[PDB]
């Protein structure tokens, strides 16, 4: 993220622009993920679990709109 | 694999006609050509285990075709193995 301040621009606007740019780049997530070594077994297990959870949540939320609570 | 020109040349040499691509003689001759060619490759790359499965499959197929031909006609078998220089 490189941010240049435009003429007449205040400082808070530039600060917010910088924060949004950093969030879009996603640097903090990378630095957090690269702090300790992870085993390939752990990595593959995490990926599979995330996919299964997303699928199950979708099925449940799509089937929960066919019943009346009261 | 073999090239179109070499394939056509072998088919002409060993078949009854340029359209006779399915005879035991043509099949055996093509397998022998490729087995002979690959000896140079495997003399330089001795740890290419994944490619050697195909070679072994070729060897087995040729053995089976020769056994069938020997059962069905001895004279053709003798002439073919003489022409190709095959025996241990």
């Amino acid at each position: 993220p490189v941010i240049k301040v435009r003429e007449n621009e205040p400082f808070d606007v530039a600060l917010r622009r910088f924060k949004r740019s950093c969030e879009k780049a996603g640097v903090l997530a990378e630095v957090r993920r690269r702090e300790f070594y992870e085993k390939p077994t752990t990595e593959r297990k995490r990926a599979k679990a995330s996919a299964v959870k997303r699928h199950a949540k979708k099925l449940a939320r799509e089937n929960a709109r066919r019943t009346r609570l009261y | 694999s073999l090239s179109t020109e070499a394939t056509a040349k072998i088919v002409s040499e060993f078949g009854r006609d340029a359209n006779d691509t399915g005879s035991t003689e043509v099949q055996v001759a093509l397998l022998t050509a490729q087995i002979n060619h690959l000896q140079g490759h495997f003399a330089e790359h001795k740890k290419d285990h994944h490619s050697r499965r195909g070679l072994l499959r070729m060897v087995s197929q040729r053995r089976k075709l020769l056994d069938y031909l020997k059962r069905k006609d001895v004279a053709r078998y003798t002439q073919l193995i003489e022409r190709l220089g095959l025996r241990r």
């Binding site: 993220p1 490189v2 879009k24 780049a25 | -």
Partner: protein, 66 residues
């Protein structure tokens, strides 16, 4: 989803086409995902190869800080 390459019936993606390739990289120089753009998988693989060739020849950057 709309895929421009499928719409225009392209055969190869041409690492020399900087004008087109520029639409598919972020401002840091990273390759944009396919669920954001709509591209098909075949063309996504072709596109990644082309971007790598351009980076090597120096017609595109690797990062935004060299």
């Amino acid at each position: 989803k709309f895929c421009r390459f499928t719409a225009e019936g392209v055969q190869e993606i041409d690492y020399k086409d900087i004008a087109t390739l520029k639409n598919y990289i972020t401002e840091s120089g990273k390759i944009v995902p396919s669920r954001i753009t709509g591209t098909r998988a075949k063309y996504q693989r072709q596109l990644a190869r082309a971007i790598k060739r351009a980076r090597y020849l120096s017609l595109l950057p690797y990062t935004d800080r060299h």
